[PDB]
């Protein structure tokens, strides 16, 4: 029962349209619980989960001002990169960032990360050790010296190993009825005859949480991965996801190919079949 | 850098004509963030647009979900019209209940 806590930051420069747009969103696993948009009536860290709005006013002030300031640090960071790369003033550039902590089944941290990307391509990431840096290009190496002398990687190790865990833990105990409630997938098989012998047999998996799911088709135990089309896992909207896998099977052979589902919500993996 | 979005138009719950349902349009994989997305009822734009908050993937590509409550019928045709900096002309993707 391994979980996670990640924070997403988007800072896109819009020259002429005033000042850049900052959109920072907080997630626990696949559950969106906090958000901040720079362009808002009065910008503040907003609750998106019932367990997070339970937290006190002094919490909401802290969280708000950090994002309010991050936006400004990002606004300057954009101008800094414009000099680094010697690029156009009028151009619209993107600054992406994501930091978070991956916690185990018994509450202790396994993976910590602080990676960021300029214009859609990786810039500088904090390595698994939580004490090292890897720069993508030569301009990413300027930030490296800056963050290796100011020991930025140390505080991050303290946050990720410390408070990141303490809070992901608080949040896990806070909204357990929505977070630790493993939703099993409501599955079934749909038959599409096509024409005569070749028929498409689709395997549906809807209403499951989290997004991690493995769907396969098997002809007498052999994986038909080469001849199976699989859609990317998509959100239904109601806190749950959906995904399908289909195979072209000739008529008569329809009662050989079996569908296989693997999910947290299931105790034993299901070997469901098409039944008229 | 410029990457075109990957559209997916599906329903929340299975196909049942007359039943109260939701029309989803999962646009993902696009870069930069600027994306114009509209949903359609028989080719006519639906004004009741409601979309998710801008999040990116581990490959740094963004993703948004434009959703609206709809009533599936037999004669009605529902599509989703996407437009991105990469897109030459607005990408209209029709909805299929078997997909």
């Amino acid at each position, epitope marked *: 029962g391994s979980h996670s806590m990640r924070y997403f930051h988007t800072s896109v420069s819009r020259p002429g349209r005033g000042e850049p747009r900052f959109i920072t969103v907080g997630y626990v696993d696949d559950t969106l619980f906090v958000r901040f948009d720079s362009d808002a009536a009065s910008p503040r860290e907003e609750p998106r989960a019932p367990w997070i709005e339970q937290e006190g006013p002094e919490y909401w002030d802290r969280e708000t001002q950090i994002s309010k300031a991050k936006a400004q640090t990002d606004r300057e960071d954009l101008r800094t990169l414009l000099r680094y790369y010697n690029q156009s003033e009028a151009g619209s550039h993107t600054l992406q960032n994501m930091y978070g902590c991956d916690v185990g089944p018994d509450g202790r941290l396994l993976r910590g990360y602080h990676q960021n990307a300029y214009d*859609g391509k990786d810039y500088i990431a904090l390595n698994e050790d939580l004490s090292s840096w890897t720069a993508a*290009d030569t301009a990413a190496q300027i930030t490296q010296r800056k963050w290796e002398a100011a020991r930025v990687a140390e505080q991050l190790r303290a946050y990720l190993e410390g408070e990141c865990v303490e809070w992901l833990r608080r949040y896990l105990e806070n909204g357990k009825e929505t977070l630790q409630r493993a939703d099993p997938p409501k599955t079934h098989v749909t038959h599409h005859p096509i024409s005569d012998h070749e028929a498409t047999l689709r395997c549906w998996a809807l209403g499951f949480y989290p997004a991690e799911i493995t769907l396969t088709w098997q002809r007498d135990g052999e994986d038909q*991965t080469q001849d199976t089309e699989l859609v990317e896992t998509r959100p239904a909207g109601d806190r749950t996801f959906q995904k399908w896998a289909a195979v072209v099977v000739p008529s008569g052979e329809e009662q050989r190919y079996t569908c296989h589902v693997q999910h947290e919500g299931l105790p034993k993996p299901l070997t469901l079949r098409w039944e008229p | 850098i410029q990457r075109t979005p990957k559209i997916q138009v599906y329903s929340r719950h299975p196909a049942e004509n007359g039943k109260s349902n939701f029309l989803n349009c999962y646009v993902s994989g696009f870069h930069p963030s600027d994306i114009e997305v509209d949903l359609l009822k028989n080719g006519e734009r639906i004004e009741k647009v409601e979309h998710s908050d801008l999040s990116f993937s*581990k490959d740094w590509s963004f993703y948004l979900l434009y959703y609206t409550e709809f009533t599936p019928t037999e004669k009605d045709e529902y599509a989703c019209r996407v437009n991105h900096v990469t897109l030459s002309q607005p990408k209209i993707v029709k909805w299929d209940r078997d997909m």
Partner: antibody
Amino acid sequence: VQLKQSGPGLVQPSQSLSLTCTVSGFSLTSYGVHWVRQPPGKGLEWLGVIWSGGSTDYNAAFISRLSIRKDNSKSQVFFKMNSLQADDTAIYYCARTFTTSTSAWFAYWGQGTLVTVSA
Amino acid sequence: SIVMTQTPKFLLVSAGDRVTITCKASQSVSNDVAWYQQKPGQSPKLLIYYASNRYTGVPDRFTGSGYGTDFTFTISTVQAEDLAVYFCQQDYSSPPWTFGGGTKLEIRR
């Protein structure tokens, strides 16, 4: 970090080309594997990619006949191209950019599979 | 779909020379260019990335430059090992990401 390719080296006209690119040193569920061909003595041509999540991008001139699918557990990525012809005779490499990003500059490449469209 | 024009198609020079290649894009690409070395019977190997950045393990003799439309690749010291077909690439556009024609590096002895 390696990409081991395997598949038939001769295809009869109007038939498919099923290829397999077996990866290692990295997880499939994270990175994206591309497919780029090279006609003998000619330039390079990017044909398609399969992303981390199972999403795909195909070179438009190929979209109907092309199909890339992957088995994350078995570290394999398959490339099936239907109804081959003389213009498709080339070496097929599977490639990857240095990081998880949707970048197209290829740090790592396969050894290539020489395919010959002939009766 | 940005046409990348590679010049010259052929390049013959003696050892210890400074040779230049030019890849010109039909449309602007904000430093999203790559440079490869394809030795016969072997795969193309990434020399440079992002126009000016040398890939890990690639020597100092191989240096790239340029931004937006004009892009050049220059070899500090030509060696017998450098013999190959040199290509360039674009990654700014949408998914079809073009390649240059190629530069056949022949040597004088």
